[PDB]
Symmetry: D2
Subunit: 116 residues, 4 copies
């Protein structure tokens, strides 16, 4: 499990539960091919998106559906979503944790990258 | 006047200067059509991207080239760029200020939507 | 001129107005002596706290009353206030801008130290 | 273990290891009495600071020594430290996780509060 996503709600001070997350990988023809997807758990975490074998070198895009999250709570947010784009495993396989801290008009994203 | 971008450097504690910024508008076929662009000033600001007249309601993508910024500084970044996607709306305030706080492995983006 | 404070509201996406701010200077006996104070403007800014002449090198504490801000909005905050402690230094740039991005259960503070 | 602290380095994209953390509780005479302290682990986490019985209602101050952290890395940071002040357990016992995202000239602090 080399790719993990963690989302927190900065308004309620709690994990952001049931947030949809889509991952894409840039193709040779520079198109974004669907790679994996899922939803955050009660702890705001999304594990099991991919494997070490599948998670090859490449440029990935993790798109977090923050809009649906805020709308379900009765809030009209600014962003359509929070999307992280990055090159992965270009110096060998690494473990990535993409953390997103959400607010209606602001979000922060941090990457904690460790060598397995 | 209606759209401004401000970028700060959290490592050196100063405005992020000469950062490339491109704005796109989502087309009917869901592809991103180039709309406006430029580079941040000595104060880390980028104004005059569009006019009230040209900035119609729609989905806009603001792509900030954070990677080139850090690479020039000789610092190894994580993200390929910082992308801020949002829907421009007449119902809400007129002026949009997209502020991005940058760090090599983390970034935050906040919108300050005001009428005046 | 040498010290400015800017506060933003990440929930409503606007400047945080009428936020109480107090600045203290650490005394020889390590107690915090009141130095300057005021409230944020309609633009979420607070200028004219001190002069270059009065702002000598030393340890300063900037206490932002985030709790009263959220309570007035009828939103339950976590923090009692946001405290930014730092050492003013002549070796580095002259002007200090303390920016605080507020959310009920989270806040960020960045310093933009520039000479001009 | 109702009080946990987590610190991440936004420059390296890794946990902030060996960061000293001091906790204080406001006394009746409004002085800050030392409550507990420790250092972050290899995962950037600090557990075992207190217990449910000891962690009574009160106003607490968690002071994170970010200055020593950056100085050890050859960087002269802006903040003397990152200090969170908050009222705890005023609506019954809760579990608190204080997360701090660090950068030389900026830091964010988030509180994830759950009902045990
Ligand atoms: O566990 C984490 C929390 Br809580 C906050 C941030 Br930011 C990142 C991670 Br990983
Ligand atoms: O001027 C700004 C600062 Br400094 C920080 C953030 Br966040 C937004 C604005 Br506008």
């Amino acid at each position: 499990c080399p790719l993990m996503v963690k989302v927190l709600d900065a308004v309620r001070g709690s994990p952001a539960i049931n947030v949809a997350v889509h991952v894409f990988r840039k193709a040779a023809d520079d198109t974004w091919e669907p790679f994996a997807s899922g939803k955050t758990s009660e702890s705001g975490e999304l594990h099991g998106l991919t494997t070490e074998e599948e998670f090859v070198e490449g440029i990935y895009k993790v798109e977090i559906d923050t809009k649906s999250y805020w709308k379900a709570l009765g809030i009209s947010p600014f962003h359509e979503h929070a999307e992280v784009v990055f090159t992965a495993n270009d110096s060998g396989p690494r473990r990535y944790t993409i953390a997103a801290l959400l607010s209606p008009y602001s979000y922060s994203t941090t990457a904690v990258v460790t060598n397995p």
